[PDB]
Paper text:
The Nano-27 binding epitope was located on the bottom region of the P domain. Interestingly, the binding site partially overlapped the Nano-4 binding site. Six P domain residues (Arg484, Gly491, Arg492, Thr493, Glu496, and Thr534) were involved in ten direct hydrogen bonds and two electrostatic interactions. Three residues (Arg484, Ala536, and Pro537) were involved in four hydrophobic interactions with Nano-27. The Nano-27 binding site comprised six conserved residues and two variable residues. The ELISA data showed that Nano-27 was strain specific, which indicated that certain variable residues likely play a crucial role in cross-reactivity. Similarly to Nano-4, Nano-27 also failed to block VLP binding to HBGAs. In the second case, Nano-4, and Nano-27 treatment induced a conformational transition from native-size VLPs (35–38 nm) to the small-size VLPs. In comparison with Nano-85, the binding sites of Nano-27 and Nano-4 were located closer to the P domain crown. In context of the complete particle, this position had fewer steric clashes with neighboring P domains.
The human norovirus genome contains three open reading frames (ORFs), where ORF1 encodes non-structural proteins, ORF2 encodes the [name] (VP1), and ORF3 encodes the minor [name] (VP2). The X-ray crystal structure of norovirus native-size VLPs showed that the VP1 can be divided into shell (S) and protruding (P) domains that are connected via a flexible hinge. The S domain forms the scaffold of the capsid, while the surface exposed P domains contain the main determinants of antigenicity and host binding epitopes. We determined the binding sites of six novel human norovirus specific Nanobodies (Nano-4, Nano-14, Nano-26, Nano-27, Nano-32, and Nano-42) using X-ray crystallography.
Numbering used by the authors:
A (entry chain C): 1 to 113
B (entry chain B): 224 to 347, 351 to 538
């Protein structure tokens, strides 16, 4: 029974703030590498952020300085703070256990006027 | 089993393992990929030295032996024949499972350095010495380290003694023109035109598509002419020494490593450290890797071949 469930998606005004969460279940969470993907219509699934066992983080150049990924090994939840949003960030955000390979359902994040 | 680990050295604290040079930048080249099968700087992750790789940084592209005689020739320059041994002084045994005496250059070109001698006999009570610039052509038919005999040339036309202990100290390259025959990924013929090379370290190539080799690049000096030649090693000499020390058993064919900025603890990019001792990255661009020199590689964990590298 391994499942990843995203939460906190929706619509927001450009330049605002939004936070995504991802509750992991049935995995060795603390050992695995967690990451956040996104998929725009007509585009591929590009890796945005990634966090490792030693809580070290990785970010994309088109994201760096804005988004923040963190993990909670106690509650087995993966977060993603998204500040200063842009209309180019409008896509489908998926959370993934990069070690095990298990994907999530994915939530929708749109930024328009 | 002993846990695997990497030495905590920044990019500015590493040296090339194929030539006695500091590591300048990281380098990839997805375009014009050749067969990478260098013999120096070859060490598996479990601490097994391969090819002609040895531990001494001063032993890379170095030679020790005695000058036999002066080669009489009407051609330009003055050529000298030199028997080579092991770096420690012991005679080289060609029946050993090695491509050449350890430390022997693993690429085609004109190696520019200094030949020095110190006489065995003593005169009322110190030995005489001499040192001159010299060039060693690894593409030459006379270049036969496997047979325990190479040949070098000098601008000096007399001041070289025979039967005296001779040392070669690598400095750089004589030239990188058309007739210089400088190719980084072209192995010399260790036995000359007599027979093909044996006991070589295995070739190196990225398995998955979209991945390319990650090289440690060092720029090498030139005696004269135009050009900016470079030498790329799979692993720095510090890594070779470290892997030999711990001798940690490899749990997987590929180990994930991260290039971390120590000031912020950020992971700049990921890389695959393969069992045989080389790095691959998921990069589309080519040339030098733009990254802070104070950054270092850190072993993350062993991974299966289901893991996909982050875009670089």
């Amino acid at each position: 029974q391994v499942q990843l469930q995203e939460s906190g998606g929706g619509l927001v005004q450009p330049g605002g703030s939004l936070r995504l969460s991802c509750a992991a279940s049935g995995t060795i969470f603390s050992r695995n590498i967690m990451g956040w993907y996104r998929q725009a219509p007509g585009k591929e699934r590009e890796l945005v952020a990634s966090i490792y066992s030693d809580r070290s983080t990785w970010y994309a150049e088109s994201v760096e300085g804005r988004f923040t990924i963190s993990r909670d090994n106690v509650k087995n939840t993966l977060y993603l703070q998204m500040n200063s949003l842009k209309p180019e960030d409008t896509a489908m955000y998926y959370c993934r256990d990069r070690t095990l390979g298990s994907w999530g359902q994915g939530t929708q994040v749109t930024v328009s006027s | 089993s002993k846990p695997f680990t990497l030495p905590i050295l920044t990019l500015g604290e590493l040296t090339n393992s194929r030539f006695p040079l500091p590591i300048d930048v990281l380098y990839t080249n997805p375009n014009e990929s050749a067969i990478v099968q260098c013999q120096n700087g070859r060490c598996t992750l479990d601490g097994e030295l391969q090819g002609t790789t040895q531990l001494l940084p001063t032993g890379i592209c170095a030679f020790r032996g005695k000058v036999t005689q002066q080669v009489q020739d009407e051609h330009r320059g003055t050529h000298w024949n030199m028997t080579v041994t092991n770096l420690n002084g012991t005679p080289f045994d060609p029946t050993e499972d090695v491509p050449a005496p350890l430390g022997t250059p693993d690429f085609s070109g004109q190696i520019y350095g200094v030949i020095s001698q110190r006489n065995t006999n003593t005169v009322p009570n110190l030995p005489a010495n001499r040192a001159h610039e010299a060039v060693i052509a690894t593409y030459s038919p006379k270049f036969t380290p496997k047979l325990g005999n190479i040949q070098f040339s000098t601008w000096e036309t007399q001041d070289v003694s025979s039967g005296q202990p001779t040392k070669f100290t690598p400095v750089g390259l004589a030239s990188v023109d058309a007739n210089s025959h400088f190719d980084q990924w072209t192995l010399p013929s260790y036995s000359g035109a007599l027979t093909l090379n044996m006991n070589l370290a295995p070739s190196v190539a990225p398995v998955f598509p979209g991945e390319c080799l990650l090289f440690f690049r060092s720029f090498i000096p030139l005696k004269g002419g135009y050009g900016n030649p470079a030498i790329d090693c799979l692993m720095p000499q510090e890594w070779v020494q470290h892997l030999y020390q711990e001798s940690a058993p490899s749990l997987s064919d590929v180990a994930l490593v991260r290039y971390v900025n120590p000031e912020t603890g950020r992971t700049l990019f990921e890389a695959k450290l393969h069992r045989n001792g080389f790095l691959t990255v998921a990069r589309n661009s080519a040339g030098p890797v733009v990254a802070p020199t104070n950054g270092y590689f850190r072993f993350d964990s062993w991974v299966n071949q289901f893991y996909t590298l982050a875009p670089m």
